[model samples]
Target chain A: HHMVIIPARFASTRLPGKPLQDINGKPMIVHVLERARESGADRIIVATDHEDVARAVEAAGGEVCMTRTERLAEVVEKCAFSDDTIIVNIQGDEPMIPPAIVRQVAENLAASGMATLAVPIHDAEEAFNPNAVKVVMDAKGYALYFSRATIPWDRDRFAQSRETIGDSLLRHIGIYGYRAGFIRRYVSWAPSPLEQIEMLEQLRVLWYGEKIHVAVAAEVPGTGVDTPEDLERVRAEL
Target chain B: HHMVIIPAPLQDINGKPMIVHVLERARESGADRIIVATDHEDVARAVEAAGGEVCMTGTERLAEVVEKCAFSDDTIIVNIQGDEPMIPPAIVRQVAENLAASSSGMATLAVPIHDAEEAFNPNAVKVVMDAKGYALYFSRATIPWDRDRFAQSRETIGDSLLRHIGIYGYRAGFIRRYVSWAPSPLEQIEMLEQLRVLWYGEKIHVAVA
Candidate 1:
């Protein structure tokens, strides 16, 4: 069975009660839940530590599961899933995340057992943007490394053009899918030093030398809301 | 027998043929047999005069050097290019031992990159290895790029940055298989022949030398 877990929280450093923030006429979490419904997931649950988020989700006629941040082990344990079950961790802030892409991630997990999504960088500006995490993959579409800095650095063009051009870089999507058993084992391990250096959670898996199969998304899933400015942008678009 | 195949046809350096220095180093590494594979008759003559076994395979690629060696399928064959005249004998033995213990059937060497100038220099190829010493990626660009400090200061490179050495140790049979495949895209982009192994999803254990 395929499952989607949206870990929403009200204690966001940029925007408190972020999941309860309004997008159009509904709470931000509701918009995420509605998108998740069309993903063909057998189950969809909102995991949050806040009661207000729980109430908002329940009021919107959605399933809610109470869970604390940094307690993914406890969340997986409570879910009590079989070894081969594919569980996706979709961010609550990404209202524009596509249902078809969500299905694609699950399908990738079913094929490779560990999976993520990426979109090609269309502009040179986004290629160098630090906020836009970059991924470099092997020939077989397995991620080799993820970083904030521009990678697969073109030795000739980068030196010649001086950051004006890039050779088709990739922007990493923050979604992940894995077996229920992998999540339980992952949380038990200490944070990897590379993970802390890049400030990327995915580096821990790479640090341990495990493969993360990357599937290029058919379309860009658009932006996720982080700051209040991002909220306004999504609000205007919605 | 442990064999060292020195791909030859290199010019003399410092009054002696460069392959002579390579032959001495291989002999010091305790290889049961060492053969200098060369396309040129002059190089073959130079190796022979130096009291080293010379094979006229007319080699073109590194894999071709191993193919000319008449070793058993599982025999470990070390490829030490004649260009590296200063290569330590100890490192040659280390790479051979690494290949013997490697699960991937191939091994190579990397030295700690100490100079910050050398670290950022695209000519100085950098290698990033996993915790278990398996190479993750090799690039001309500075890798494990210090996200926080690079833009502000380029003075000090992290101690963990490694410069990939050109030496390699592999099984004779694996060498045959390696040459049959076309060059991988990453290999073409980086201009590194070794990237072909990683692109094919085979591991290359990197040992500190």
Candidate 2:
């Protein structure tokens, strides 16, 4: 049975009652819950700190589990989920994500310990813009780094002209899929340097020298080294 | 002949074009000839006026010129970016010498990051080198963030940090092939074209300038 836990907080960085914020006449959390249900999961829990959020989930015919500001560890612990149980984390505000995208991360996590989804960015502004985050991966489809800063900075093409962005960049989707035990291990680590700098939760895994395999979110276009010159030569040059 | 090509396509600095400063230094270095590679006629005129040779390229990409120029494959071509007006002739010779001294395809330079502000600044472009002075990584993001020392304060940084210098020395043959390969993901994201070498598991020797 697949399990999905959504952390819906009342106080958000944007809207004060972010979960209650209206989108197309429906509250944001309700749309998120509807999307989760469409994913065809066995169980869906709205892990939230506020009664307003809990009531919103209940009114929308979704299960609600109360938790503190940081919800993952407490909810996973509360359920006593087996280490192998698939757990997908969906943010309360990511309304544009498709149901198949949600299901993809879960199945991806089931295959491994953890996984996430991303979408190809088509627009030049979206690729270069800081608000739209960027992700790069390795040959194994594992994420290398996440940055708000324009990465994969095209030294060649952009040097001649920067207004036209090529198709190399992938914008990150905020949804995640992981095993029950993965969340426990995740909350244990200190916020990593790149993570804190980029404000990307995923970077901590890279900082610890571990891997997080990332997959492309289906549909929705744009929607989601060692060379040696030993150190001595370097020391000698400067 | 040790040839130094200064790819300055520039923003002027200190009243004169930045390329002139780099051209002057490239001339000072023991290299046989100083070629200023550019597409702009104004820059070409600047090079000619400065008593330096000029090679006009369509793409202005170093690899493109390295091929079009058709220099012998064995010839080591040094690239001194016009932006680095402060680069010394000694360092220019040293980078070219490093390429001459090593079996590696490319050689560049870095300087110890003593200033706390420069170390944290993204424009500074930090480099981390392996034990043998090979480049491991280069990024605008402050790297090698000391887990312990930095957590307390970024007020001061220690010796491991090195800021990348723009000068480069490359063999004509390798550089020609380098431009043809698809840009690696690391190279694309960091916007550092040099990273394409390391992504392919090729070697780049980096000396401290």
Candidate 3:
């Protein structure tokens, strides 16, 4: 069976009580629940640190798993999924995230056991954005490396014309699907050099020589809310 | 038998042909046989005059040398670049031993890069390896970009950085197929011939020099 666990921290320095914010009439976490439910998952749980967020999820008739902000992985391990169980980790802020994208990642996990999603970078400017993580993959759709620096460093064309660059670059999606066993072992391993340097947790898996199959999403995914402006944009879109 | 191949048409250094120095080191390096593979008659004559075995390969392609090889695919072929006149004989012996010991069928060498300046220099050709000392990727850009250290001190490189040595130890069969495969995109972009092996998902073990 598949499970979706959305890690929602209640105390946001920039946007306090972010998960409980109203996206339309309902709380933002509730909207995320609806999206998860649409994916036809067997179970959906909102993992939260604060009682208010847990209460909000419970009041909405959804499942809630309590976890500390720093102890998220420890709480996830307590879920006791079988070695082969596929677990999808979704961000709580992505209310408009398509059900199909969630299902795609899960199905990708079915084939690869460890997989993630990526979307082609349509804008050349976004390719250079450090905030927008870029991923380069092998010919067989497995991620070679993910970096804040622009990769596949279009050697000749970059200097001549940045705008004319092709769609070889991909923006990494935060969502990940992993076998329960892999996730359990992943958390136990010490921090890796590449992981700490790139500030990307996924790099630990790559550094350990585990292949993470990268499935290119069929459609552009809706943006996840991170800041006040991002929240406002989602509200406008709604 | 250990066979040393010196790709020729190399220039003379200090009034002696470049391959001559390589020949001298190769002889002392425990190679049972040494053959100069060259397209030019001048190179062949130079090796012959130096009292070293020489062969006219008639073509510059490395695969052609392998094709002309009398040994089987399992035979180890140590490709010593003609330009590396200063390469140590012990390093050559190490590369061959590493290749023989590894199951991957190919072996190369890397030296720890000491300076942060060289680590960031694209021409330096950085290499990142897995826990088992197998090369994961080789790039012209700085890699394993140490985050915490870089965040604290941006100018210095981490202790784990390594720079790749161009010398290679390959099986005769591997060299044969490597030539047939079209130039890989990553190889062309990185301007590294070794990337072709990694692109094909073939492993290359790196022996620390």
Alpha-carbon RMSD, each predicted model: 2.2, 14.0, 2.8
lDDT for model 3 comes to 0.78
Per-residue C-alpha lDDT of model 2 across residues A155-233, encoded as one tens digit per residue: 5666566688777788887677788787778788877545554456676666665567789877652121011231122
Residue A9, model 1, lDDT:
54
Tens-digit lDDT track for model 2 on B1-209? 58888777456677777788887778888888677777789898877987888887722366766666777888888888777777778988898888888775889899898988997776788775544566645776565554445655768777767899878888888887786677777765566777777666566889887
Candidate 1 per-residue C-alpha lDDT over B42-128 given as tens digits, one digit per residue, 9 for 90 to 100: 778888998998877612454665655556778888888877877888999999888887775789899988899998888888877
Q: Regarding DockQ, does 1 or 3 come out ahead?
A: 1
**Model 3 TM-score?**
0.90
DockQ of 1: 0.56
**Runs off by more than 4 Å, candidate 1:** A164-168, B9-14, B58-62
| Native contacts kept, each candidate | 0.40, 0.11, 0.29
lDDT of 3 by residue, B8-102 (tens): 64675789988888888888788877878877887777889999887666123556666675667777778787778888999999888888888
lDDT of 1 at B16: 80
Q: What's the fnat for candidate 1, on a 0 to 1 scale?
A: 0.40
Task: List where candidate 2 sits over 4 angstroms from the true fold.
Answer: A20-27, A221-238, B1-209
Q: After superposition, how far is residue B167 of candidate 2 from its true place, in Å?
A: 14
Using lDDT, give the best candidate's number. Answer: 1
Q: Could you give candidate 3's fraction of true interface contacts? A: 0.29
